[PDB]
Design a protein around this ligand. Structure first.
Ligand SMILES: CSC1=N[C@@](C)(c2ccccc2)C(=O)N1Nc1ccccc1
Lengths: 443, 54
């Protein structure tokens, strides 16, 4: 049983489409337990100045009961069967999923459909959640990492839709109407823009059947079955600096525009990020870590942590890094960081990519560790690539990557580009934009 | 702000702005600011009528 063989013997992912336009996909295994959910192509990016944070507001009511069954009833029924109900809303994607015994795959599918189609939107529950959401905005405001990434999007995509945060504005949350949420749901939670995904011990045909039974309400016009292409979001080389020397450590995020889901180069960018890696003060490896940047961080105590990232989207994306450091080590950290980025475009080695490729393989395999994560892969893949991509395909693609390819792709997206910068906390030591911009060439 | 590149550039600019008058004077009016009396070898016995400094 070799790695190759195990990859080929993995059960295939089955997909079928209903007449209403909804897609049903699932990967079958022999597990008494399973996860099934509906991945919707909706998010803050689809909102606008007036209904920003509606998709989030909805995510708060999607579990407070439907028309067929009020709050208590809905909750009791789900709880009493040992099932877990979770979900989330991002900028371009939303999801509501359930974990339970394969023995209930069908009852669950009915529950899901009831959630996405007949949300009660209890007028009173809405005012109750209005205050809850307002408390979460103050909680999240202390999450420097997330405040920093929000700011990164706020400036990198300023003037556009991707500039808004998922949770939305205070004004919006204070004034969103029962009608707005309703409108949101109707406008976005639509069959062709959704995906019923399930993984575990489930019958694809039994899944698709319960699907036909509950996911119905077909469309008449053509405007109801077309998936609206979103207007492009302009990337802008710039920086937003939120200074507060009262904060203990500083967060910094730098990034360049990325390609977008469908682009093959993403396989290389991920290998690239694998070379630089990530780090945090609890990595036993210490000064021996393969990641050069990580090694330097340890030697010179450059930061508390740092991480690379390649955040994709339909038509764009953010490729960069983020670090947390003491006010007095920001400059050296940024220096070494930008240094490693130059090394990438200019002097990557075969040994380097070899390691990074391996690291990347076990990374993709790790994202399929359980029913929920695999179910998440399916929902996302069909929603982003319009098809599931096997580990064997990925591996096929990953294997083709070499040093030269890394240098060329990185040079393409990084070298001499104007980055987007977001800095929060005690950032006096972080040099100006011009100096950082110069770190973008020669290495 | 860091001296470079803000003031390194600003200073090079200032240099060339003040270098034009300098060179214009130097190349187009070499003696505009000098006493013609200094084109005459020093004579310990004759004092110029109007002794004025630079
Ligand atoms: C060697 S004579 C001299 N040296 C100069 C360049 C000078 C003087 C004092 C301080 C700095 C520079 C100047 O103007 N003169 N001429 C001169 C003519 C009449 C009366 C006084 C001086």
């Amino acid at each position: 049983a070799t790695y190759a063989q195990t990859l080929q013997n993995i059960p295939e992912t089955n997909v079928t489409t209903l007449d209403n336009g909804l897609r049903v996909a699932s990967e079958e295994s022999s597990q008494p337990t399973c996860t099934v959910g509906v991945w919707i192509g909706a998010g803050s990016r689809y909102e606008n100045e007036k209904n920003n944070g509606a998709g989030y507001f909805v995510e708060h009511l999607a579990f407070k009961g439907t028309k067929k069954r009020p709050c208590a009833a809905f909750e009791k029924e789900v709880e009493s069967m040992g099932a877990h109900f979770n979900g989330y809303t991002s900028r371009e994607q939303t999801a509501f999923y359930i974990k339970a015994l394969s023995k209930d795959m069908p009852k669950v599918v009915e529950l899901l459909a009831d959630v996405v189609q007949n949300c009660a939107l209890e007028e009173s529950q809405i005012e109750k959640e209005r205050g809850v959401i307002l408390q979460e905005l103050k909680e999240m405001d202390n999450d420097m990492t997330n405040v920093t990434f929000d700011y990164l999007h706020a400036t990198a995509f300023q003037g556009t839709a991707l500039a808004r945060t998922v949770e939305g504005t205070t004004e919006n949350i204070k004034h969103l109407t029962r009608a707005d949420l309703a409108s949101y749901i109707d406008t976005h939670f639509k069959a062709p823009r959704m995906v019923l995904a399930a993984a575990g011990g489930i019958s694809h045909k039994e899944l698709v059947d319960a699907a036909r039974q509950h996911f119905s309400g077909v469309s008449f016009t053509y405007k109801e079955d077309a998936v609206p292409i979103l207007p492009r979001c302009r990337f802008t080389g710039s920086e937003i600096r939120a200074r507060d020397d009262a904060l203990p450590v500083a967060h910094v995020a730098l990034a360049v525009e990325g390609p977008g889901w469908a682009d093959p180069d993403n396989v290389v960018l991920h290998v690239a990020n694998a070379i630089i890696g990530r780090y945090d003060r609890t990595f036993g490896g210490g000064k021996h870590l393969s990641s050069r940047l990580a090694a330097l961080a340890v030697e010179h105590k450059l930061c508390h942590s740092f991480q690379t990232f390649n955040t994709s989207y339909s038509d764009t994306g953010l490729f960069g890094f983020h670090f947390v450091a003491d006010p007095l080590s920001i400059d050296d950290m940024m220096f070494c960081a930008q240094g490693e980025w130059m090394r990438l475009c200019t002097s990557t080695t075969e040994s380097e990519v070899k390691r990074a490729k391996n690291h990347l393989r076990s990374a993709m395999v790790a994202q399929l560790d359980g029913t929920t994560p695999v179910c998440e892969t399916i929902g996302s893949h069909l929603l982003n690539y319009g098809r599931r991509i096997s580990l064997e395909e990925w591996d096929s693609r990953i294997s083709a990557v070499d040093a030269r390819m890394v240098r060329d792709v990185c040079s393409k997206y990084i070298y001499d580009k104007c980055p987007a910068l977001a800095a929060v906390g005690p950032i006096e030591q972080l040099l100006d934009y011009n100096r950082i911009r110069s770190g973008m060439y020669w290495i | 702000i860091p001296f470079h590149p803000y003031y390194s550039f600003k200073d090079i600019l200032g240099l060339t702005l003040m270098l034009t008058p300098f060179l214009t004077l130097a190349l187009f009016s070499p003696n505009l600011l000098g006493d013609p009396e200094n084109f005459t070898p020093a004579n310990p016995l004759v004092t110029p009528p109007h002794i004025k400094p630079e």
